[PDB]
Amino acid sequence: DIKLFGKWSTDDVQINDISLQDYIAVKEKYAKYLPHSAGRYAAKRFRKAQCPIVERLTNSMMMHGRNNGKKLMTVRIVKHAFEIIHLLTGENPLQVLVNAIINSGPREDSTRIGRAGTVRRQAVDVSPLRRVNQAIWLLCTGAREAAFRNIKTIAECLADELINAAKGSSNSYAIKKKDELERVAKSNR
Amino acid sequence: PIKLARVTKVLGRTGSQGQCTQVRVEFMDDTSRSIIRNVKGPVREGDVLTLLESEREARRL
Amino acid sequence: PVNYYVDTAVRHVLLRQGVLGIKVKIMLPWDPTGKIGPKKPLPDHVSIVEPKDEILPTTPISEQK
Amino acid sequence: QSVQVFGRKKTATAVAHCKRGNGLIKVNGRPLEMIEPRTLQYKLLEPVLLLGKERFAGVDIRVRVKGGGHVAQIYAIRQSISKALVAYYQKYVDEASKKEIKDILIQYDRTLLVADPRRCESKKFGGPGARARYQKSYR
Amino acid sequence: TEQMTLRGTLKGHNGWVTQIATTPQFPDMILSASRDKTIIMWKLTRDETNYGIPQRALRGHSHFVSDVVISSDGQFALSGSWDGTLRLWDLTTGTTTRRFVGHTKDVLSVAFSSDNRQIVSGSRDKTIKLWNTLGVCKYTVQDESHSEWVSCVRFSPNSSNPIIVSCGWDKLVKVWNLANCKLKTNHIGHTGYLNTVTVSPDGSLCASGGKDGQAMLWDLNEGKHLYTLDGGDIINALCFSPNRYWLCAATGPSIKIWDLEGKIIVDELKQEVISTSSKAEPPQCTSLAWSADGQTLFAGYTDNLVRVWQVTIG
Amino acid sequence: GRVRTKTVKKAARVIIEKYYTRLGNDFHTNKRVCEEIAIIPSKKLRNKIAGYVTHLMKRIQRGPVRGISIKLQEEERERRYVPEVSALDQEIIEVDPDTKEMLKLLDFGSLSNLQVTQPTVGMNFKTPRG
RNA sequence: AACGAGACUCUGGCAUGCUAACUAGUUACGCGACCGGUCGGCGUAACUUCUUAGAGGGACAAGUGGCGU
């Protein structure tokens, strides 16, 4: 039925976790023709889980100062990344995106106890919505400082840090910094 | 031994800067083992977590 | 309501050794206009009329006129 | 046979006149594929890609837009067409098909039929905008 | 020996229904005012999934549609609303024709005569207004009409002298004469404010229901209290049955259908299906309409829904 | 929050205590009766009062409300009850032996409706202190 | 009881209900131009949806379910 960018099917994808079951977007009714729908989801608590996750990626992709309002420059980045994913892995670019979200979010964190400047942490659980938010804040971050000055264009570098993050490879920036947050999560336990 | 878990009821909110929510945690293997685990993030009733360790009780910070 | 229920006046008096300044305010009354005070009431003053005792009925009176 | 309704985002108001016809939908004297931001072409085509050309077969709409920006003009147009077909199918066709259109329109996106009321805040002295303040020094 | 079954529900509104109008001209088209600024013209498909469909909503008002009375032919309707205007429609168009200006407060009830040339309107303005069909103020009753609001005014569908009646919130049932506008009979027998008065289809028997819940019966042409029916809570509507000769008393949660002469209840019309809402109050019966055949009773509640009835002939 | 100040609640309570018959459970009807009885300025105060009147008339039907008059609040309950026989019209009145000695000094030992029960035989009526 | 708070005043959001509009227009009719279509192109005509600004509605924790001496 509804195709993202008119060319990606939305029903053949399959989530794997149940911890991120409802806090990951589109399966059957969040199928939007475009990422930018311009809804108001920051109005009350627990409403950014019910916006499309491609829109979550584009919203977290305009997160530099010189690009802090440009969204029609951002939908032509997911449109210029999902085709690169569909040519590199040969299947739906939405499924690999969900697999990159699931493997990149930390599942165990530590909070600072003590005064200002010094730390003595203690390990705590991670909420599932914060696991979703921490994933896009890492996956979106990885496609900026990589593609800063290394000539290559930024639109395919988002695919470079999404496809290598779906498999759980250690060359992707997100699961690296996830496991750097996990080694310090093992340090207290 | 990666264990998966439920959420019954958040108790309060603790930590130094109030960030840590205290939630009463059920297991998804249908046992009545009601562990208390501190969680960092927005959590409501009916959530499902992935506990790496599943033996430490919650304590104040 | 401070715009039409009060009226302020500032006058400087000149004495021997300096200036005194006086400030006078008056909170005007009601009377929908009697050419004194505003017509508008104070906007939190609720006034409730007293009910008049209607004659209680005992029998169904079918009174033609 | 005439139905005339408007749609609104922030400052853009797009009124839309709907009469019966063949299916000529031309906003501002231009067909929908020719609006220069083509990146929201699917946002523009979300009515016809949800209701089908058979509902748009006996219609004739020329949407009249002004005000706003670009994105606010696009979001004002798609509300106007969707609000025009509802009033058309209410005034001339029975209530049932109007209900079938309206229910799937609000099930897709409520913005398509009722407007977004949020509009710009005033600037306050002491800062560059509405809430942000000028940086204050100490010592 | 005859029951009242839930054949269907007329679910199309958002606000509380206030009045349903029926006609002998059409046993299929049903008009029902409501509290969502919209009168919906129904079309009774009588299907097993639904007894009726919405056909043409009369979206024209700007406040609560307080009352709807229709003409002899099934093309015209007179409607009162809380904005102070009267919207005179034309049912095949879905488009108003007139608008009657001159009521400064909430128009509570209207009524339409048989000859379609006399229009009476009772409002919170404490004024009784006689209207020509064009829009002329024929008569404003400033003849000491009522000291409070007038809840319901009604014409008399009689072969005798056409008379009007005006119950008020000052517990007075006043009778006035058409084209004379003189008070004919006062009825001081009510504790609590009056709500509805309606006339038996012979044009000689009037029932008056108030806040006490006690429907008081009155004559028109001679004017005397005949019987004293009792009910439960506040009466919201009163009708008659032209075929079965019954008193259609509308209490709050249930319709107490009463006999005019035997004063025996046929059926008690109270239906509860949920147990979660046991801490709340059940919806109150405001709209009551008796069709021309009398087989179908159209009752409407405050759950934005109208419950139709069928008489199990046994 | 939405906490009604004492202007709203005071005017609502005195309208309740003066006009309990005109009021009901619908908000919009009570909105109209307060604006003709009372002289209320700008519309947001008329709406806040009439909501408290609706919320207050909801609560009087369930029992007592401490803020309004007792005489009225009790009287409405009575108006909104006669048992056929009195609760003091019993046939068997169970009395103690010591009660019948008092009636014997009251020269009322000749009553027929009495039934002298035996009292309990354990002298235990205090709480086990500690 | 009173001041302060609140109320109040201005502003933002809704009205195909009302009031109107050659210094605002829509729709229609002819005319003109170029391929039944495009006109911020010309003049009459119904009327206020758009556009202006007045009057008035509208929302009150009102309805429902929990938690509440």
**b/e code D97-119 from CB counts within 10 Å (16+ = b):** ebbebbeebeebbebbbebbeee
Residue spans of the domains in chain A: they are 1-189
With contact defined as 3+ CB pairs under 8 Å, the chains touching D are A, E
Which residues in chain E have Cβ-Cβ distances shorter than 8 Å to D83? none
Tell me, what DSSP letter sits at residue E292?
A: S
Spacing of E197 CA from G8 C1' in Å: 44
Q: Phi, psi at residue F13, to the nearest 5°? A: -70, -35
Resolution rounded to one decimal, in angstroms? 3.0
**E15 in reach of chain C (CB within 8 A):** no
- In this structure, is the CB of residue F117 within 7 Å of any atom belonging to strand G? no
Measuring CA to CA, which residue among A16, A20, A104 is closest to residue A60? A104
Spacing of C41 CA from G8 C1' in Å: 11
Residue whose pair of structure tokens reads 């409730």 in the numeric block: C48
Q: Which CATH architecture has domain F1-61?
A: Orthogonal Bundle (1.10)
Paired sense of beta strands E39-43 and E29-32, if any? antiparallel
Residues 232-251 of E with CB under 8 A from F: 234
Cross-chain Cβ contact A189/B56 below 8 Å: yes
Query: Contact E231/E251 with Cβ under 8 angstroms?
Result: yes
Measuring CA to CA, which residue among D19, D20, D9, D14 is closest to residue D32? D14
Chain G footprint bases within 7 A of protein beta carbons: 1, 5-9, 11-18, 26-28, 37-40, 49-51, 56-66
- In this structure, is the CB of residue D8 within 7 Å of any atom belonging to strand G? yes
Which residues in chain F have Cβ-Cβ distances shorter than 8 Å to E192? 21
Domain containing B15 equals 1-61
F9: distance to nearest CA of chain E, Å?
A: 24
Measuring CA to CA, which residue among A96, A159, A126 is closest to residue A23? A126
The experimental technique behind this entry is cryo-EM
The CA distance from E166 to E152, in Å, is 6
Query: Contact E31/E77 with Cβ under 8 angstroms?
Result: yes
Are C and B touching by the rule of 3+ CB pairs within 8 Å? no
Helices (H), D1-139: 41-45, 48-51, 71-91, 95-108
- In this structure, is the CB of residue F118 within 7 Å of any atom belonging to strand G? no
- In this structure, is the CB of residue F32 within 7 Å of any atom belonging to strand G? no
With contact defined as 3+ CB pairs under 8 Å, the chains touching E are C, D, F
- In this structure, is the CB of residue F34 within 7 Å of any atom belonging to strand G? no
Helices (H), chain A: 53-59, 75-88, 93-104, 128-145, 154-166, 173-186
**b/e code B6-42 from CB counts within 10 Å (16+ = b):** bbeeeeeebbeeebbbbbbbbbeeeeeeebebbbbbb
The CA distance from C48 to F46, in Å, is 12
Measuring CA to CA, which residue among D31, D32, D28, D33 is closest to residue D64? D28
- In this structure, is the CB of residue F62 within 7 Å of any atom belonging to strand G? no
- In this structure, is the CB of residue F51 within 7 Å of any atom belonging to strand G? yes
Secondary element (H or E) of residue C19 = strand C19-27
Residues of chain E (72-131) having a beta carbon less than 7 angstroms from strand G? 83, 85, 96, 99, 101
Q: Residue E296 has which token pair?
A: 């179908």
Residue whose pair of structure tokens reads 């409002």 in the numeric block: E123
Spacing of A10 CA from G16 C1' in Å: 40
Tell me, what DSSP letter sits at residue A131?
A: H
The CA distance from F88 to C12, in Å, is 85
Q: Total domain count for chain B?
A: 1
Query: Contact D23/D53 with Cβ under 8 angstroms?
Result: yes
Spacing of A50 CA from G5 C1' in Å: 39
The CA distance from E104 to E230, in Å, is 36
Residues of chain C (25-54) having a beta carbon less than 7 angstroms from strand G? 42-44
Which residues in chain E have Cβ-Cβ distances shorter than 8 Å to F21? 192-193, 211
Spacing of C34 CA from G2 C1' in Å: 26
The CA distance from E76 to E114, in Å, is 12
